[model samples]
Target chain A: PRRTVVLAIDLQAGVTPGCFDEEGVLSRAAALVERARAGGVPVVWVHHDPVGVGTPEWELAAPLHRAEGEPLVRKNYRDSFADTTLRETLDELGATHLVITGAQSDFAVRTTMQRAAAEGYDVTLVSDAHTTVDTEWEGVRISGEQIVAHTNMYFSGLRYPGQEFVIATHDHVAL
Target chain B: PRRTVVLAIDLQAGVTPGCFDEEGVLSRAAALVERARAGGVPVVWVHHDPVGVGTPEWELAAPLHRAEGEPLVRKNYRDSFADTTLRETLDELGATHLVITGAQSDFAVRTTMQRAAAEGYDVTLVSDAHTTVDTEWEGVRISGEQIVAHTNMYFSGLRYPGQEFVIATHDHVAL
Candidate 1:
């Protein structure tokens, strides 16, 4: 109900592959998108790029669609604000609070959330609406579920001086 | 070998009391500070304040000391840059890279690390030189070791466009 924007990060066909509960994350995120639109909140789409931009995998995944008026922010870095016009765009839109849900929970999602929160914006991370894939680090396989759990755990109380960083589920995030 | 600064975050007495391996972290961080100052690398000290700033616990810990010439960037927020002059200070110091180590791995430390990295600064987190305290979240008691381990794991490869967020032990981080 406030001047908030929903930032859907890297929910592309190429990104969400093999992530833990990709379907569920996409479903929950899509539901939030629809709710935000219905509640008269703006939705911003963000994605990363590399080799092969015009391919089929570059598009937003199933159940998520960007309206013609929505601004699409493109980023080459994991943090969506890095070297991007996202801050200016958000300022133009008067976005004081950001509801984040996306792919690659450990990378872009986590980084963007911190960056926005650090910049004094109220950031709410949709906990169950984001996902990550498994990877081998230090010769040990890190599970996606473990990554998500750790993210949820750490993000549950990300505190700032006058800014609030909240971790909410898809069903509970204020639209 | 680079224009780097060691950002020692929240190593104050009040901040590090119940953190994991406080002695070891302070010891190792002191080593980094010595190495940095000796190597002509700037050592920037940052801390948060609130209920009484002139108390003993508000000062930096025993092993760590801020030199007269060193910049003391005070912050009330978890992210060092939020509503602070940290960015201008770093720019004036010409520090393109940041080597981070300090207290409360899950909160201020984590937030500052991600914020700096997102701003295009190369961030190297001294994995063993940072610590956190145990807490109860979601009705479950989480250990400080688990918090530190999760931070190390997640921060191991926090990648940006041309920036690097490395997780290295105190002994291995570049001065």
Candidate 2:
């Protein structure tokens, strides 16, 4: 509890719609956030901005709520740690382990997770709680499930000296 | 040429031999490094450990050579900037743009590219110069060409505040 932070990344109303199993992610993640606070674990919230600040889209989703005065990092880039106080906030909170969940698996979620693992955070990605929209490259279409599965597998393989990564279900993840 | 550096990441003998289009990447990258030096652009070399230091595999590939005193970062992780002097080396060279090329596109190439973009380097990923192996997750197999193409496209879309990512062919990229 003291060393862990549940980073709720870009879980905004505007961002998550049409993501793979959107409702499933919201249901699981809403409960996960609720559960983390009850366990005395810190939950840090992040919202990507170009959804822009002070707009309805910039706010967190209706179901997700920040726990009192926890960190609300406003990220301007895909990597949340980029131009944001995320790493400093983690350091301030004594965070050595990160439980990550959020929208658009292949973009912000993937970028942030890769950096976190390299910086030596013990990361537990909620395998069932992260989702991305179906995407196209050149001419080929990639399914949402394939994107989601691939991101989890890549994350699970990340190793940085003594740091580690785990892909766990929302229920099984350690705070 | 003034602000750009050729980041030849994990272009090691052991790590790169079996990557997709292995010969294609090596031939082009070998030439790209040669071309960059001739243009007066700094070329920084990186080798990840556990190929272990001082082993044959830990060294850069036979065709790749370090010119004079250019930095050869010894990385222990996929993301080269983590726990290495890479950022400082870039800073010392007064680099504001990163021309990136390397092996195993899905791992070190992908990770390093993300951080480079986030940290405000105008990154040009040589699309035809990076490669990865065919990968499998559970029962599904993904080809190295797909991984390479996907990485290039994803990198092209990375926008960090005011920074940018561009996927350019080796022959077309700005030095």
C-alpha RMSD for every candidate: 3.2, 2.8
Q: Candidate 1: where is the Cα deviation over 4 Å?
A: A134-143, A159-164, B135-143, B161-167
lDDT of 1 by residue, A1-175 (tens): 3488999999998889899998999999999999988989899999787513888788898978889799998888777888888999999999999999998898888888878876779889898999998765434465677677777887776777667778899889987
Candidate 2: regions farther than 4 A off: A52-56, A59-70, A85-92, A118-120, B52-56, B59-70
Clashes of each: 0, 0
- Which candidate's DockQ is highest? 2
In terms of TM-score, the best-performing candidate is 2
Interface RMSD of the candidates, in order: 3.5, 2.0
Give the CAPRI rating of model 1.
acceptable
For model 2 the local lDDT of residue A122 reads: 88
Docking class of 2: acceptable
